[model samples]
Target chain A: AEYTLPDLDWDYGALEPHISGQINELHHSKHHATYVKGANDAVAKLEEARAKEDHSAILLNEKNLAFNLAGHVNHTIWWKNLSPNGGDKPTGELAAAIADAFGSFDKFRAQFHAAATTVQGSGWAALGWDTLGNKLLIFQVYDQQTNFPLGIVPLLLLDMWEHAFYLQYKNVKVDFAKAFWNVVNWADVQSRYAAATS
Target chain B: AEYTLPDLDWDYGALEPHISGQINELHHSKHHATYVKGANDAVAKLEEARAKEDHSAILLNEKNLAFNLAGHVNHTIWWKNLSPNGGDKPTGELAAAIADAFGSFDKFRAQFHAAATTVQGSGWAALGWDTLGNKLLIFQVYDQQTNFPLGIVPLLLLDMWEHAFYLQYKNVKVDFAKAFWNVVNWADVQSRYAAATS
Candidate 1:
């Protein structure tokens, strides 16, 4: 169950135009990659500190590790949840539930877009599935993967940091949100639902 | 150096009806009290772990201390930032910044309310002074304080948890946000601005 960094699923230019290959490469290969390795390194160092009983020396680094590791854990799921050749609408029973919970798919998109486009800092705009309530929820997650309660599974995530777009959009973030829609993997979402629920 | 609890600024029932007696008592006495104790415990534990050369243990507890203490610090400012008789407009430099940053105070409240009331779960709605840009920004924060970046300073906060108003307003979160306008201590906000910028 230990998912390594190399096993993480994504590709360069998959979300191009909306998200340029250059940005994606840097965001993934550099930004997220640093957090991933930083997290592992932190834990490794902490274990060493524990063995040597050097709590004072290792305290600061361990805290940094937790923050970065949490980010790594979160981004890994976020990347796989989106795709260029994915999504249109829900199918079968999922469609009925979407209508029942949110009134319509269009309305849900409106709410999701507002949350995603307007997030104020380094964070995520997520369309989450809550099996207990069996409903669809839109959330604005700040800094990597945070600010949510237990039992909610993410079905979609849109990163809102400046690094995610500033190169191309230059402050027009909603345009990226518009472009991201084209690449959502609804089938992946369906499979995640099945795995999580059933 | 030390900001202790059981704030003496206002009585529990001072803002009664607008903020009911029971809800105010619970929010301050119970909820805030729990966080204060939690933060203190984390700090104490971190100190002990550090002194014993248990770096990993110290590191784990230090973060818990910072986050929980940050909640205590934030909510402490929140309670005093309100008054039984307040709200309705800003004056002096604060007012000037309001107009300059948001076009008008009216638009500021409109946007602030939208951000505050629409937060998905447990979080704070904040009006921030983005130091880098020297402009006001609004955000919905998760947990104690994850949504904001380092340079931003808190100007005003609206606590939207059910504990803030559910006992009085039930599910009418909008009414709670609306009523808060009448109790907003703009002078306290002004002082925070003066201190933050300095």
Candidate 2:
């Protein structure tokens, strides 16, 4: 099946103050759309290779598949993870889980924030549910697709890619990561957690 | 326990034509050693954080741990993956596995070669044993620590970091990757496969 770019639930400007409208517009329309196209193209190429019985390009195609497909998946979830009415803290079981895994909410925030700000290159800061351990864990993802264990189910994701905050935050990435807290849809994260555990 | 750098199995000049002595010397003594030190330092910091109950630095320390520790592991495996007496194709079960996983040895080489040459930045190309699937698969790893699924044991690894080749190959990375084939320690790879499967 072909992958498609997802629509944002809110307008680009809705994330105002924390995330600028310009950054959001380009991130969803250009950066994410490019990944969608790349993924489709890679799939098509693999199909062609199969038809011709020529798998010489398997590595190139597969690399593209992992890179682009992952980008599409990450961005798809990220849009919904934000909300104009979002922010503050998670509640209920999700909140309890966070405290259990990270010792407390403040510690989790500090760690997640550090992960986002210290990324050497393009990447993400994700809060994931570890199926094996049955706990929440923080992951520092590199270039959308790397540096994470396979069994992790993402609950909250923060894009640290340059295009995500460069226009608004520039070299001061710490500020961007800090501001992200204001728009984080804890409800979305809690829902993801429920789905993962169930 | 602190991570320590492993001594190279062969002398720096052993793989002369395939990989230059200067590159090997600097890569091992400088680059690899740095990762070892970084890994140790990160561990120490984490210990200090735990002792003081100060988890604010957990994210920074953990990121360092993953990055440097992965670098140490990759380089440690890589040094052994090369040999002056290496080259040619594998025989026995290993050869059969390669053919099964990649269609044929030629296809595997082409794909692996493409992976090495096309890495966007610092990374690796690895042949791994997928425990879940009970088959061999190729992986593209980013920055030594990312883009691989857990439970897949590495059998053969190729360092794509610029330091692995930049000194001799310069900007023509393809030449370096092609030369690497002449020095691949298939015996080492076969041994790793045996251990992983066992």
Candidate 3:
């Protein structure tokens, strides 16, 4: 399939103060767009290789496809994981589930935030629902494409790429992670959690 | 099960100039050894989690499993792909396969080197044999685990992680990549190809 970028649901300025408009502007317009373009190109290249019966280039193109498509997938989720009126802990079943799975909401938050802060290199932090086993799981995804468990669904996402925050935070990513909590869209997370659990 | 670091075929200083002893020592003893240890720990953690039927920590442990196991797999292939008296190009079936797959050895080298030099962060450049397609492929592996196609066997590997060459080449990865050509074990790659094809 020819992948295309989707327009941001909220304006670049919507989640300001926590995540600057400047960061959102470039992150969405440039970084996210690049992945969209790359994913399409990868699909096209694979088709071309098949037509030509050329498998030499297949590995490179396949790798690109995974990287770009995963990048696109993570960014799409990440954009929705934040909101203008986001913050405050989740309530109802999601909150109860968090407490049941993680001992308590505060413990979950501490662990998740720590995972986000220490993602090794160009990566992201995620709260994922393991479909097969039925539970919440935290992932420190390495790069846009890696360290992912199959059959798990992303419930919450935290973009940790330097491009996601560098202009405002310099090398201080921990503060940026702290700022992210203020804008997290618990509603979107709850919605995802419901769908995944179902 | 525990994973142990394998012994190198040659001494640390065997592939001098092309790969310095200092770089080799650190890359093997400290770096590759770390992956082996991590992989074992991940396995142990998973066993513990399974024993309790608690999947809360599964995501992190699974990520570690993939990361460190792939690290071990990659480094194991990389060590054999280099040799003190190995260089130039392949002959016979491996040579024919290279030409058939990549047009020519020079073209293969150019593409492979470009992939290696431009790996965004920590990663690897590999010539993999696609078992299903029955052809040779060039891959730019992201970190240790991501961006890899399932069922492909490693024919040749180039570690692009900074620790592989930082002390010897600094930021000029191109030169480091160029130096690697002088020690490439074409015979080993050929052997791998033969086994994969058979």
Candidate 4:
């Protein structure tokens, strides 16, 4: 199936007072849109290479596919987990899972915060479900495409790149991470967890 | 002590007609030197992060170390295996080992060329000795830091990145790969093979 950017469930300004309207607009229309375009281009390039028996192009295209497709997938999930009337804390199965996985909800919050604040270059801090181990885990994704273990499904993403927050948060990534809690669509996270676990 | 770019055994233009002096000089002075600098900086960053007890910075620094260190090692191997009085193929243990592992030298050549031309983005086509299997193998390395199986010692490296050949070869990667044979320092490859096998 051709990958396309998912429409936001809420208005760009809806993420306030956590995320600014301008930052949200640029992210969705620019960064996220580019990944969608890159994915489609990679697919076309790979098909063209294969049709022509061009092994070299094929290899290059494959890497492009991975990098771009992962970017699209990550951003698609990101938009769903942000809402104006979101945040506070989880209440049901998702809450239980988070506690069990990280020893407590607060502990999970701390680890996730650490993941968000420390990304070296352009990357993400993500909460994921490892189907292999049937557990919740967090990891740093390098440059959108790498450091992702196989058989894992991302449940939530915290884009740690400067473009994600530098506009409003400046160099205070910690503050941005803290503010994100205010708009986290926990119900959306619950839905994803339910689907993934089931 | 910080790692530094090793001086080329031959003059920049000495391998000429096969490889241009312009490509050699830029590749050595600019490209390879950058890796050495990156490696040193990564080492310093890791130490600083460690002193501050910054876990996230540590993770990023470690990957930075791996990437830059690998690039340095790869280029160091590459320069030693190019010579003005090179080519015409191997004789002795390295030759027999090539035949034994790859069926014949001609098969190895074809495989290496395929590896060189098929690299996606920035990478190398390397011939390495697998310590565990104790055999010669050809494989595509990704972005100077990825797809490397552990415990293998590189015997010969043909850089497939754009900086390696683009100035002279443009997009004709296969032709570049073909031309590399004219400057292959078989004696250096033989010495590497002898050390590894023994």
Candidate 5:
């Protein structure tokens, strides 16, 4: 199947007071959008070159494809897990799931935040509902893509990339994450969980 | 001054839920505390070996010091950054400083969380107050104690060692960290910030 960029519903500036209008604008339109274009172009070119048996620029285009596509995949998931007016409290199924799986919402929250906040270099924090195990789980991922056993579906993802915030916070990231609850999109998280399991 | 483990006040179960009582117990008492003892022992051994001109044993002691001291310093910072009831908001000068440094509360958070959550390897999400820049900064540090630049003061830290969780969450570190706020020790953080600048 031919891959295409996923449609994102939220406006860039929606999650204000956490991610500013300008930052979101540039992040989605400039950074991620650029990745989208770059990646698609690389893919198109790669296909053409393959048909023509031209592999000279294969290495270069391959590098571009990986870098840009990874950016797109990473950023796309990031935008979903957050919301401008998200994060009230986990409700219904997720709350029970959190309790049943993690022992309690409190315990679940602690481990998730610690793992998310304790990464090295750049990567992601994921809440994966292990369909196989029939439970909620977590992963401290690395880079654009990695760190999970095969088969665990990604239910929720959080991005910890510098381009996501360095312009505003010189280095005070802890306070930033703490205040981010005002914008967490738990509704979307629920949808994601449903998709992962069902 | 003879180096000894500083009095790290929170009980092992203080940060429960985010870190399990069991995980926290082992993490603090067995893991971090051991590093403290190990560091002191290595230093003592190194000093004595040097004094006796036992050069052959000095390398062994030095390696021991490096490994254990790194563990001690890293966990020391880790212990200070969390609070069981932490993660609501920042207050006073630090809060104001965060805004000045990062533009607003929300933008600062997204960046910090991104830096923290996206770490590629075993490392930390560090919120540093740059003495020279006079601003708060966040970094995704890699590999215990090796990546941070000299002269910067650490404000907040989160450890991403697998031993920090694994048993409880299996690979579900994200969920583990979410519960971390329940027992984060902000008072310790404030004190550390005060000490670093003073």
Candidate 6:
């Protein structure tokens, strides 16, 4: 089955004041849709190559697959991870886990904010479930899929891509990251953590 | 504890005909060593920040931590994943896993080769163990630390950083990737796979 662009649960303007409706619309309608399309195209091309037994063009297509598929996956999660009513902090097991892994909510927020702002190029700052270690950790993800170890399930994600904030936040990425907190749907993150652990 | 550069198992010139002595020496002594130093510095800075309870400087230090630490770790694996007496192919469980996951050694080789040649920027192409899926997978890593899922244990790594090949192969990155196979330490890779699975 082909991957489709997911509808945002909240209106495009819903996250305004923190994230502008215009940025949200562009980020979703334009950028994310492209990744979804590219991922599907890559899959079709791989199938074509397999049918022809032609591995010569595999590199280009495979690169597309990894990049586009990661883009789609990350964006889908990003959309769900945000809400107009989001932010403040986690509670219950998620809050406890954050404290256990990073000392306290304040420390985790500082660290996560830092990870999001200091990305050298386009990427994300993610709170992931380190399944092997049975803990939560923050990751400075590069270009949607890079630098992250496989199997650690993402719980919370902040997109640091230019398309994500350039039109709104411009050069001051720190402001974008800071604003992101206000819209970070902790409930969605908690649900993701629960599902991953289970 | 501070991170330190690991000594290469073979002499700089040992993997000649594929990778040059000059490249290896410069890469190990200068490049890899810098990351070790940077990683140590980041750790120190982080500790300093923690002591003062000044979270403002945390992002820069954390960025350095992720980047330099990943560089140190990746380079350490890359050195071992190559050997003067390497090449040919894996045997035993590793070989069987490659076949099982990727269909055949030739298919895996083609896919891996493609991944190595098409990296968008400074990065690596890696063979890793997907612990959750309990299978082997290939990744196109960006820089040293990005685009990877957390917890996938690395098996074999190919450094696609220009410093890793540019002095010898120049603009033709494919040539560098092609030459890489001739020096791949399948034994070391197999060992990594064994340990990861265990």
| Candidate 3 chain B: 10-residue stretch with minimal lDDT | B46-55
Clashing residue pairs in candidate 1 are A55-B53, A55-B54, A55-B55, A83-A183
Off by over 4 Å in 2: A1-60, A64-145, A148-198
Select the stronger candidate by TM-score from 3 and 4.
3
Which regions of candidate 3 are displaced past 4 Å?
A1-145, A148-198
lDDT of 6 by residue, B70-186 (tens): 787788888999999999989999999888767788878877777777777787888887553465767778788776555567889999999988899999899989999899999
TM-score, B chain, candidate 6? 0.98
Stronger candidate by lDDT (1 vs 6): 6
Candidate 5's docking class is incorrect
Better of 1 and 6 by DockQ: 6
DockQ of 3: 0.08
Question: lDDT tens digits, residues B26-83, model 3?
Answer: 9899998998898778756655554454556645776886677668778877899989
lDDT of 3: 0.78
Which candidate ranks first by DockQ, i.e. highest?
Answer: 6
Recovered native contacts, candidate 2: 0.14
C-alpha RMSD of each candidate structure in angstroms:
21.2, 8.0, 10.9, 11.2, 16.7, 5.8
lDDT by candidate, in order shown:
0.65, 0.79, 0.78, 0.84, 0.69, 0.80
What value does the lDDT take at residue A79 in candidate 1?
Answer: 77
**Model 1 C-alpha lDDT per residue in residues A1-198, reported as the tens digit of each score:** 222464435578777665788887887888888877775675455445444544453324424543565566566656776677776776766566556655676655665666666565776776666442354555466666354423345666777878878898888888888876777777776776665555
DockQ of each: 0.02, 0.11, 0.08, 0.03, 0.05, 0.21
* TM-score of every candidate's chain A: 0.84, 0.98, 0.97, 0.96, 0.82, 0.98
- TM-score for each predicted model, relative to the true structure: 0.52, 0.60, 0.56, 0.55, 0.49, 0.66
Tens digits of per-residue lDDT, candidate 6, A1-198, equal 577899999899999889989998999999999989987787677556655667677566767867877788789889999999988999998889877667788878887887787788888888877543465667678777676544557889999998888888889888989989898999999899888788
| Model 4 iRMSD vs. native | 10.6
Candidate 1 positional error at A120, Å: 23
Give the per-residue lDDT of model 4 (tens digit) for B81-188. 998899999998899999998889999998988887865346789999999887789889876878879889989999886556655654456788999999999999
Please provide, for model 2 over B6-83, each residue's C-alpha lDDT reduced to its tens digit, 9 standing for 90 to 100: 888888999998899999999999999998898677756755564466666655776786687678778888999999
